[PDB]
Amino acid sequence: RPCDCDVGGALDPQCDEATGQCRCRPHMIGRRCEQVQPGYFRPFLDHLTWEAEGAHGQVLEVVERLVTNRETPSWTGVGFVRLREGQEVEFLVTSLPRAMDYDLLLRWEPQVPEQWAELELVVQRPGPVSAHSPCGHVLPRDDRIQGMLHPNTRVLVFPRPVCLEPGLSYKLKLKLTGTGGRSGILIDSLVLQPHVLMLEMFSGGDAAALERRTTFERYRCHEEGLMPSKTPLSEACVPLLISASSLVYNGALPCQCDPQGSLSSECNPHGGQCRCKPGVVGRRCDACATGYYGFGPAGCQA
Ligand SMILES: [Ca+2]
Ligand SMILES: [Cl-]
């Protein structure tokens, strides 16, 4: 009997008529709006990734890396950028899904043993934050954040999140002020991970919210976002990420598989990977693998 619509996938908490159908956000389906529509996907917590090697600004050395039969690369894009003391990388960030806090993850790889580094991140906005926006509380101190890279890691979560808004273009500047050990550092990318625990499905006061919050933290579901590799999560994480993603993105996103590079318009509904032709890479199968050429109907060749 009970409605029990999806807290994330449906608009109202109760069903209509005697069909038991809920009102769904865009491209969520099922009687309770609990399923992603074929042709659409729920994004991974690290969907919003900007490659260091795609960055504008001062000329920096690109360090390419080849995929080996080992599979499971530890980087994305062609590889990395080598950043030395005093140099800066500019990430041009646009098209964010929602006005909320994002945690900043810097993915990197050291060049000497026991390597540490000191960094400064500055958020540059296209105007003053408005009093009526969810980011209206932001002040200048909130938009400059220091971070330290520690030995034996490949990702840093900066110690404070940033509040960013949809429909706007930002420039996030990353400066390396010092690095040593006992040729600089390699930077892979910057990831903007939505801080989904602030959503009411978790942060609310009701018993149902407290349970979701407890489960999310116990199984550390937020770790999906840390690295390119995706190791299977506890099954308990799955419906929580489906619901949280629907609330961030307003339902599910269209796959947008590249017509030439993909075998199909239909991508994986968890994370959105398209099925690539030989020699093709990228979520949308829209680039040649490194060392391959000739993007077209057949794929790419070495
Ligand atoms: Ca990269
Ligand atoms: Cl993408």
Author numbering: 523 to 704, 714 to 833
Task: Reproduce, without paraphrasing, sentences from the article in which this PDB structure was first reported.
The β2 LE5-LF-LE6 structure was solved by the multiple isomorphous replacement method and refined to Rfree = 0.210 at 1.85 Å resolution. The β2 LE5-LF-LE6 fragment has a surprisingly compact structure with approximate dimensions of 60 Å × 50 Å × 40 Å. The 220 residues inserted between LE5 and LE6 are folded into two distinct regions, a 10-stranded β-sandwich (residues 564–726) and an α-helical region (727–783). The α-helical region of the LF domain consists of three helices held together by a disulphide bond, Cys752–Cys768, and a substantial hydrophobic core (Val727, Leu730, Met732, Phe733, Phe747, Leu771, Leu772, Ala775, Val779) that is conserved in other LF domains. A search for related structures using PDBeFold revealed that the β-sandwich of the LF domain is related to the family 35 carbohydrate binding module (CBM35) structure, despite pairwise sequence identities of just over 10%; the α-helical region of the LF domain has no counterpart in CBM35 or any other protein. An unexpected feature of the laminin β2 LE5-LF-LE6 structure is the relative arrangement of LE5 and LE6, which closely resembles the canonical arrangement of LE domains that are not separated by an inserted domain. Thus, the LF domain is inserted into the short arm of laminin β chains without interrupting the regular array of LE domains.
A major function of laminins is to form cell-associated polymers, which provide structural support as well as platforms for signalling. The LE repeats are interrupted once (β and γ chains) or twice (α chains) by globular domains of unknown function.
